[PDB]
Symmetry: C2
Subunit: 68 residues, 2 copies
């Protein structure tokens, strides 16, 4: 099975692309279930990367204010 991207931008781009394929009404039942499993994994990667980024900004905000 295909390796799963771990960076936000690639994961997001595959997720968008999986969604369109899902909505164009041409994926057989079985491919639709694969696309679903795949997209859950991709969305999880996107959210993990965003949580990391949120945390990094918070830490920077704290660091900015600390000297004041």
């Amino acid at each position: 099975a295909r390796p799963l991207p771990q960076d936000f931008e690639t994961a997001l781009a595959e997720l968008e692309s999986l969604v369109s394929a899902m909505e164009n009404g041409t994926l057989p039942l079985e491919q639709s279930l694969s696309a679903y499993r795949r997209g859950v994994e991709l969305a999880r990667v996107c959210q993990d990367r965003l949580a990391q980024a949120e945390q990094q900004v918070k830490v920077l905000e704290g660091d900015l204010l600390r000297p004041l």
Copy 2:
């Protein structure tokens, strides 16, 4: 007083500028007036970052919802 240079509106550049202000603040060489100017720029920069993250998070949540929609059978009572 206020830093009048245009404000980045993209996550990467705002984050990068934010890191440089933090570096400048935690060098202590900053007189008070410049610290406060650096702080306000800082808050504006962090706000761009937090806005873009919030939007990306919402975009991902919408995409998740769109993925699940075609797998919904017709509603029962």
